[PDB]
Design a protein around this ligand. Sequence first.
Ligand SMILES: */[SH]=c1/[nH]nc(-c2cccc(Br)c2)[nH]1
Ligand code: NA
Length: 309
Amino acid sequence: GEAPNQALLRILKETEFKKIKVLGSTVYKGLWIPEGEKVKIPVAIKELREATSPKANKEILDEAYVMASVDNPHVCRLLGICLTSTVQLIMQLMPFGCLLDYVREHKDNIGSQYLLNWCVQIAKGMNYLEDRRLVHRDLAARNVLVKTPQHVKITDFGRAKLLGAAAAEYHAEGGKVPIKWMALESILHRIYTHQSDVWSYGVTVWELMTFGSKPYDGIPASEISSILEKGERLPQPPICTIDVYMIMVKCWMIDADSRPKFRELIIEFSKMARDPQRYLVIQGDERMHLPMDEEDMDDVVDADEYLIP
Ligand SMILES: */[SH]=c1/[nH]nc(-c2cccc(Br)c2)[nH]1
Ligand code: NA
């Protein structure tokens, strides 16, 4: 019916971590020293907030299932889980944070080469999730992390659903949903496909090309479906040639099958990335430049160079 999932879930002991500092609020940053391996791995630890909630633990372990089952350079991977009172996911440290905050903070230093390269990397991540019959359902600039300015990865598998062997669409049943990133068929009929992820990819690319503007800003979510039905779409960003904007608009077609495939978005953004100043017009583009303190950094290895059978 479907291939067995032989991914390994690694259970890590509390004695393998040296939690250096705290990131957010319960988000933490630290080092993972696998039991006698002479390696230190920078990690982000997501430890449980409420901690009292059986519902919270079901959801955290669903995320861990998906993150443990993915292996791609443009997708965040789970190093393992810590089975203490609060169930923690241990993940690779992405030291520059979310791409949304990164484009807001560094507008003045982001050239066309970075922007179009990010678009290719996200399309590659999303194409890999499709090969794995996985629908993300929450693609947004906030859910892409920056390992380096040259290297981003898709994250937040909180809404991710594995399509059934014979189930092309997933049918959801209510909650707090990200309306402004969602395909029309998802807002109306709670239908979700690879093609509805493409719609979200479009909105994500618009966030990047506007240096992190809020889509349909100051419009309440209740009217978004009506606006889209009338045929309104997000406006052409100033830096965007019609070439780039036409690709975004195709991601926002009402016929889901008329939207591009992730594999096509890889091709189209790659061609544009070979001649970036022809596709994005940014003031001062040719000038733009983009790039921790623990006692001993000698045995530090990035998770991406730390592989296990
Ligand atoms: S690749 C990766 N590293 N950190 C994270 C992460 C941080 C905070 C929230 C989530 Br869902 C993931 N993933
Ligand atoms: Na979506």
